[PDB]
Enzyme design. Structure first.
Site, mmCIF file in Angstrom:
data_model
loop_
_atom_site.group_PDB
_atom_site.id
_atom_site.type_symbol
_atom_site.label_atom_id
_atom_site.label_comp_id
_atom_site.label_asym_id
_atom_site.label_seq_id
_atom_site.Cartn_x
_atom_site.Cartn_y
_atom_site.Cartn_z
ATOM 1 N N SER B 197 47.026 48.077 24.304
ATOM 2 C CA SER B 197 47.328 46.748 23.741
ATOM 3 C C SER B 197 47.560 46.804 22.258
ATOM 4 C CB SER B 197 46.213 45.733 24.035
ATOM 5 N N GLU B 324 51.510 41.937 33.452
ATOM 6 C CA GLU B 324 51.148 41.894 32.045
ATOM 7 C C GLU B 324 50.886 40.527 31.493
ATOM 8 O OE1 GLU B 324 50.696 44.315 29.819
ATOM 9 O OE2 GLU B 324 51.230 45.993 31.106
ATOM 10 N N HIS B 437 46.823 43.207 32.939
ATOM 11 C CA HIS B 437 46.895 43.908 31.684
ATOM 12 C C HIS B 437 45.459 44.255 31.272
ATOM 13 C CE1 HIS B 437 48.085 43.987 27.215
ATOM 14 N NE2 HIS B 437 46.805 43.676 27.126
HETATM 15 O O1 LIG Z 1 45.301 43.700 22.677
HETATM 16 C C1 LIG Z 1 46.036 43.359 23.729
HETATM 17 O O2 LIG Z 1 46.406 44.458 24.588
HETATM 18 C C2 LIG Z 1 44.865 42.522 24.274
HETATM 19 C C3 LIG Z 1 44.727 41.131 23.926
HETATM 20 C C4 LIG Z 1 43.634 40.382 24.312
HETATM 21 C C5 LIG Z 1 42.610 40.987 25.054
HETATM 22 C C6 LIG Z 1 42.712 42.408 25.487
HETATM 23 N N1 LIG Z 1 41.652 43.020 26.152
HETATM 24 C C7 LIG Z 1 41.095 41.983 27.003
HETATM 25 C C8 LIG Z 1 40.517 43.470 25.327
HETATM 26 C C9 LIG Z 1 41.826 44.407 26.719
HETATM 27 C C10 LIG Z 1 43.868 43.148 25.101
HETATM 28 C C11 LIG Z 1 47.251 42.550 23.218
HETATM 29 F F1 LIG Z 1 46.926 41.506 22.291
HETATM 30 F F2 LIG Z 1 48.174 43.333 22.514
HETATM 31 F F3 LIG Z 1 47.948 42.067 24.373
#
Ligand SMILES: *O[C@](O)(c1cccc([N+](C)(C)C)c1)C(F)(F)F
Ligand SMILES: *O[C@](O)(c1cccc([N+](C)(C)C)c1)C(F)(F)F
EC number: 3.1.1.7
Lengths: 526, 526
Positions: B197, B324, B437
């Protein structure tokens, strides 16, 4: 005798044509307007001054002056559509096939032929009203109209050459049918006007023009609507293409009447010769001298009219063939040839789409491509051949029709929609072309009924099945005596027309038509 | 003893953690930068001043100050991602899991966590490097960085609070790993940085920033690229959101340093409280304080760099989960709820797409809809639920990644692409959400290896299968010891990752990605 007839214009002597095992009476070439030759060229038609003695109506009249297709000489596929008679400015005649014995009063069907408004003939083999007349006990009439510059040159300001003069000829023949078809056995109250391509789009224009509505009861439109991109031009455009044709013949363009006189002096072929040099863009499926939105024949823009229910409210039967593009691509697009699979390179496909959307800006072209190209197969000879076919058909026949259908179902008195998807076993055109635009006509006019034409029995069947659906709709306003449902803005049901059991589908090309009817235009204004 | 270690910064005493049947050594919470508390808040990190005596590295360090997700209290699905320790500004620590016996020099993998740059923790259960370390004989390191205003507030002009300060913390931990991992048994020449992410997008930023390239060998990016729409903002935007947060706390905004002092006085939660009030639009999948393109960390715009091969050329392993969008919709889109099928009305779908493309003009919104809606089924609860999911995923993760992939394959030294499409049997989130995701992470870190976690055997399998593909790639630059092909701008092969036989596909979301990567942007400049 069945053959001799008395009409308001005079008495006419007909002929008895043989049809299948029986016979029928045919009245061929009854004039309905004063010969548009002389200084009457471009002028609107006058009514036929009554004649003395019997008018011998036994043979086909001259065809109008027009462009003859020479691309595939000897080729039937290409020539079935060519003038089979002496082309002549004196071509305003009408034909009637009456059953035997002649009826009291029965359903009439007036056939208006197509040809991009640049060509057409009433006298041609696939338009023989006899099989339909005889089979369904119906009075079949075919009329003729000035095509090309002759019928559609439009110097608006002038009265010597206003537009739509050729659309007026259709009207005046409709009048004569109205005023005289009773003496032949037809019910003037039950007259259906059916047409294909420019014919079917002419049909929709008479449903629109206030001045024509009262002269007919119901309409059948096949592969054409008045709202098609190639069916109308602004008074302006008509003016410019008028002078362009003027330059081409070295005419004094300084004065509208000097321009008109010049044009009125030039022999016919001189006009036909440069007819195409006046279009304002490199493009396919677009023609030179077409009807104009003049405020007379059309009180307003077509979309306004369509919007405000400003049109004759009756029942209509309209359809669309499967492969509407082919013919046009194989004629003006680089890549398509008659004798090959016409697999298309993406270098040709890109110029193909430039030719189809002549108004499209880059982004327009870009959006059209995003919609029609398989990204899982960028360059595929076949994929692009077909994808181009759909681009032409959708944008030039399908989507405009579906639009007119949806806008009209809201105020009309019943609409029936079909999808002809059947390639005749004996088709002479290359297979890639599929169910070609214009090839349902022969099924409607009953050619499959003649053995010596080599059709399968399933086709004789589909011909009788269609002819009935057609006739029956003329007499009733409903094709049903299967069970063809009504088109409705909600369900949007329609049916296939082929040798298989009638299936009822929904939403014809809905996905693609919202792109063409809503998206593209909205995008193009930016 | 295996537990006591001597590093350039001092000696640290570790712990022996049990893993499966065996044991392993864990060094938890080694500091790597001076505690960013005090007037050092917002400032860049300093290196850890060497310590006297042994640094007890047996327990998890405090988590950084951040936004805790309270929407689904008690709900595991929502809380597995929440700070499991005392949040504190003093959170710049690092963790290392070393095999037993400790190696000579072996492959190192540094894990950088995600969280929209607003959240994240190194100390959390799904990030336990132990199963991976032990199973693949690898040195696993997890670092920490200042998220939110603390790590990303960006008043460019100033040196007291320039941007990317939290991206610098990642870097300084990478440095320490580089300078000291040998004393733990790791080969500083074979250090792979993997992240998910925002983590995976951070990973791609270090591949880009000239200043980081030399500190690591290869990269693994899961569901994120530096070119994602939510990963970077202009110096400008960073300035405004800086002052907005200023207004929110009633700070003297007249002077950059008075603004900085005010912010530096406010307790941490006061900042977290209004963190969200500063975004400039109603939108989903967009965050407040994110990295800025400042000319320092990033010498230029990302697309320029991507274009001109201005980036570390090594081998990368990057992927994307099936569903996603879900998580994001179920959090900020009207219509989606945890306890229901979240069938969506077209009234909600339309506001859904307004929330996804916050920059879109009407026509932009119009084109997005034309692409994502089934015209054969305008309003379908399901159809729109899923169609909205794809809109979010494609535009926020898939298409940007595929772009970075294509642009990078041209200059890189080998790329491997995957498509994780497997919903864990024990998933606690509602089924509509699908392959969510963030839910591959657990397979990568080997949770399916523990029985008491209730996974199927096929899942223990896929966990070992993936962990290897991962480790093996770290050590070699090729995941292969199946047969995962190389991504190539020509073929564009990739493979599915699930409990079924590895299938090789081509062109991931090609159709939709040309719309997002080429069309939409071109349209939007008009
Ligand atoms: O960081 C991301 O991949 C993301 C956003 C919000 C929450 C999460 N998790 C729940 C911790 C894995 C991951 C984003 F913002 F790039 F999509
Ligand atoms: O008139 C059409 O339907 C048309 C154009 C060219 C040729 C033909 N026919 C071959 C005669 C049937 C029909 C048009 F222009 F509207 F598509």
């Amino acid at each position: 005798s069945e053959l001799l007839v008395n009409t308001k214009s005079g008495k006419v002597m007909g002929t008895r044509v043989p049809v299948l095992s029986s016979h029928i009476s045919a009245f061929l070439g009854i004039p309905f307007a004063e010969p548009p030759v002389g200084n009457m060229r471009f002028r609107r038609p006058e009514p036929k001054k009554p004649w003395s003695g019997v008018w011998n109506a036994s043979t086909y009249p001259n065809n109008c002056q027009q462009y003859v297709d020479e691309q595939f000489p000897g080729f039937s596929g290409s020539e079935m559509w060519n003038p089979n008679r002496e082309m002549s400015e004196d071509c305003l005649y009408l034909n009637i096939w009456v059953p035997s014995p002649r009826p009291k009063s029965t359903t009439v069907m007036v056939w208006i032929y197509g040809g991009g408004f640049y060509s057409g003939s009433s006298t041609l083999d696939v338009y023989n009203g006899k099989y339909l007349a005889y089979t369904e006990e119906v009075v079949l009439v075919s009329l003729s109209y000035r095509v090309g510059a002759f019928g559609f040159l439009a110097l608006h300001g002038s009265q010597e050459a206003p537009g739509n003069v050729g659309l007026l000829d259709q009207r005046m023949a409709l009048q004569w049918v109205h005023d005289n078809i009773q003496f032949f056995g037809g019910d003037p109250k039950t007259v259906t006007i059916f047409g294909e391509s420019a014919g079917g789009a002419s049909v929709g224009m008479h449903i629109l023009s206030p001045g024509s509505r009262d002269l007919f009861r119901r309409a059948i439109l096949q592969s054409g609507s008045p709202n098609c991109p190639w069916a109308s031009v602004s008074v302006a455009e008509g003016r410019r293409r008028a002078v362009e044709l003027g330059r081409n013949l070295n005419c004094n363009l300084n004065s509208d009447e000097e321009l008109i006189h010049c044009l009125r002096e030039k022999k016919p072929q001189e006009l036909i010769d440069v007819e195409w040099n006046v279009l304002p863009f490199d493009s396919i499926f677009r023609f030179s001298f077409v009807p104009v939105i003049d405020g007379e024949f059309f009180p307003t823009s077509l979309e306004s009219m369509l919007n405000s229910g400003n049109f004759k409210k009756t029942q209509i039967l309209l359809g669309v063939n499967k492969d509407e593009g082919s013919f046009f691509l194989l004629y003006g697009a680089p890549g398509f040839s008659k004798d090959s699979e016409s697999k298309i390179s993406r270098e040709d496909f890109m110029s193909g789409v430039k030719l189809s959307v002549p108004h499209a800006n880059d982004l327009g072209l870009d959006a059209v491509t995003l919609q029609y190209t398989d990204w899982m197969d960028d360059n595929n000879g076949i994929k692009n051949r077909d994808g181009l076919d759909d681009i032409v058909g959708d944008h030039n026949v399908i989507c405009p029709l579906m639009h007119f259908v949806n806008k009209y179902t809201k105020f009309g008195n019943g609409t029936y929609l079909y999808f002809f998807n059947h390639r005749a076993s004996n088709l002479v055109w290359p297979e890639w072309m599929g169910v070609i635009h214009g090839y349902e006509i022969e099924f409607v006019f009953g050619l499959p009924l003649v053995k010596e034409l080599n059709y399968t029995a399933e086709e004789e069947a589909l011909s009788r099945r269609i002819m009935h659906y057609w006739a029956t709709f003329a007499k009733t306003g409903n094709p049903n005596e299967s069970k063809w449902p009504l088109f409705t803005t909600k369900e949007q049901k329609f049916i296939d027309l082929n040798t298989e059991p009638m299936k009822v589908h929904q939403r014809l090309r809905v996905q693609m038509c919202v792109f063409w009817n809503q998206f593209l235009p909205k995008l193009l204004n930016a």
